[PDB]
Design a binder for this molecule. Structure first.
Ligand SMILES: N[C@@H](Cc1c[nH]c2ccccc12)C(=O)O
Lengths: 331, 331
């Protein structure tokens, strides 16, 4: 390994294909090419589900299982439960002094999320402030590399900004994380939307059966105006093609259906039927891996408790350097 | 010692006659009819002193010395360093979900502080949400009684609202704090301004030599319309008489001085000379104990390290109930 990479998810439900193409398979590969930390963002989940704590609790082990089923080896990845690392909240408080309300107010991702949630000015303080909580996560674990979807760059950049101001004001003991950009943008939902999410109900979960995956693909949005096979169709806006573009290994094969489709002799069903097995092929192992851990629940809890202990040790080391850099009384 | 009282100060400079009249005297009283905790809030002090960590650090011990000098008994009061109790930062983050940005912006006392600070919109985030970290301080130490001036009432009411919301959402595990209202009007500065402050340069510190006190009193604003002794002078607005009301043991004398002053023949000199005698009597025992704790520096450190340990333990207990009430993973 080499760089410390920090990635994570708000435990609110089971992971889906979006996480897969979006990042899971990426960390699966940088897992032996670096020191991977996966944060089950328990606390950040509550800025949104503070009134559904049961929901979050249940999903920590659920997402950890998704992690294991996806190919993350317990011997190479450190899984950490955020709430069991209070050092993160402590650094979040110190970090809140390094940024202004106005600056937090212009974060494009949080702004859209607020508008989507319908909060108005009645935004929960913890949610409005979550980007700095993420900044604390990154710096506390000493992460130098952070995979970021095109959508999470503002947060990465604000972390670098907070980290830089911290090093200048106190002592340079924090590392500025760099971003790792990806190719496949936010995998769209079955809906045809831009975001795939169990909330939106347009998702294919990693634990869905072979039947459900097929069903999901069959109901997947395709292309209006294209009423019957024969007719010519267009790829743009069609989620089946952007799906194949992230789950199908043979592009020469992909670019192929793209030709016929634009012509008239490739029924939407054919594209779908094909895609459903390209998905079944990428999921086949995942299902069997899941089964293994489902039978070995003790192991899942192991992965989580051992990873958390390990991550806390790193967080505590960093906070020690932080508290002395800040000249807090006693250090 | 029945109800638990929590009071505090942000360590940013030495304490002065304003703190003595408006809080410390009552505090020396409370340590005998309650379990008194006094928080050296260096975390909160950093909300606006994040660019001067050294100043805050050096004032933790300096204010503790002032507490001792003022008569706070190391055997009756628990003095804790906010910094040393990370549980407070942990609880503030969870409390952040129970309040809206909208409601935080409406706080009249923080709104005025932001106005006097001149931040504009460039308000540091830590400062904007400091009322919540304070609600965390109260709830964590399990305080049921909090001395308050009508200026800190919205801080208190907001703690009450947060405690209530936390109890309804999770479990009724936090004690609702009750106010111990005012201490009668705040002491004005030497120049008659509404506020006494080292920054405004119109304060008498508890540590000032009997000499210095004398000098500061002589330079006091009085009555712009009073020019010589023979002339009648005004009492209202005259801080010299406001000082006399707050510390002169016998009102019969204060009234007589007031009378003769409005009449004529009583110059500012005689009046101030008497004020010096009264302040030296109130301050004398404060200087002696202060001097003592200067010989026995370990005694001051002992006062803070021990109170902190007790405080830390109390906060750990509350967080335990908090983590279980919130159904956090592993609790
Ligand atoms: N002046 C500080 C004093 C303080 C800090 N933390 C506290 C907690 C409880 C009561 C008072 C305080 C304030 O506005 O709060």
């Amino acid at each position: 390994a080499r760089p410390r990479v920090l990635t994570g998810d708000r435990p609110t439900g089971a992971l889906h294909l979006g996480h897969l193409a979006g990042s899971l398979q990426n960390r699966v590969r940088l897992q032996d090419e670096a020191e991977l930390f996966v944060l089950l963002a328990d606390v950040q989940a509550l800025t949104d589900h503070f009134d559904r704590p049961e929901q979050v609790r249940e999903n920590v082990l659920a997402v950890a299982l998704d992690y294991l089923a996806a190919g993350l080896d317990p011997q190479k990845t450190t899984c950490v439960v955020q709430s069991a690392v209070p050092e993160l909240a402590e650094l979040t408080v110190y970090f809140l002094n390094l940024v202004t309300v106005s600056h937090l107010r212009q974060n494009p991702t949080v702004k859209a999320e607020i508008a989507q949630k319908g909060y108005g000015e009645r935004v929960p303080a913890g949610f409005f402030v979550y980007p700095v909580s993420q900044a604390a996560d990154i710096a506390a674990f000493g992460a130098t590399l952070v995979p970021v979807g095109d959508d999470q760059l503002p947060m990465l950049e604000q972390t670098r900004e907070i980290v830089r101001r911290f090093n200048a004001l106190y002592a340079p003991v924090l590392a500025e994380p760099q971003a790792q950009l990806s190719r496949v943008p936010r995998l769209p939902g079955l809906d045809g939307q831009a975001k795939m999410s169990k909330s939106l109900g347009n998702a294919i979960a990693l634990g869905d059966s072979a039947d459900e995956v097929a069903r999901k693909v069959m109901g997947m949005y395709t292309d209006p105006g294209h009423l019957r096979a024969s007719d010519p169709g267009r790829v743009e806006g069609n989620p089946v093609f952007t799906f194949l573009d992230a789950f199908d290994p043979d592009p020469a094969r992909v670019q192929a259906l793209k030709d016929q489709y634009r012509a008239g002799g490739l029924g939407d069903v054919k594209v779908k039927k094909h895609l459903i097995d390209v998905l079944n092929g990428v999921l086949a192992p995942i299902r069997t891996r899941r089964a293994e851990y489902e039978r070995d629940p003790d192991a899942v809890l192991r992965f989580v408790t051992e990873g958390t202990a390990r991550g806390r040790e790193v967080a505590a080391q960093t906070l020690g350097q932080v508290r002395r850099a800040m000249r807090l009384f006693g250090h």
